[PDB]
Amino acid sequence: GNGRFLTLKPLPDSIIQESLEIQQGVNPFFIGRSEDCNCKIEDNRLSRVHCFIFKKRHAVGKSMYESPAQGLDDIWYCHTGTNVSYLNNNRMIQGTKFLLQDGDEIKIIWDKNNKFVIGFKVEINDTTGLFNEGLGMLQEQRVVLKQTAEEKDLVKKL
């Protein structure tokens, strides 16, 4: 790795026109209002640590015939905010996890009545020897998983 792996850039579509870069060296990358979060985004609607991205080693079930993408790394997006975050088309409730693909647009906060719309664009610039970068490609087609004691533990020491 050169230093940066994933790029979360609060796009103009969102009230925020900034760019965030998740250093492959930092796992997991926390985002939210509180500076404690690797990423700094303060939106009264979201919690201190609205959500955080975590990278994990991608491993298939079996490979005694077919040749998959080997056991590399996959970047996951973890959500801990109450307002809920939305990844493209998958819902992200407090304690959820979803795979992030190069060019993944995640919604941190959306309000129809308040017109409060936030969202960052995930762009993988560097691939630290990844199976691809983070496009999933497995049993379930782009599905939002739930967080476990492992993920919750990462934020516990935030």
Binding site: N44, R45, G81, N83, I109, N113
Partner: peptide, 9 residues
């Protein structure tokens, strides 16, 4: 002290 998440309706 600003500990309050403006949860939307």
């Amino acid at each position: 002290e600003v500990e309050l998440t403006q949860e939307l309706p």
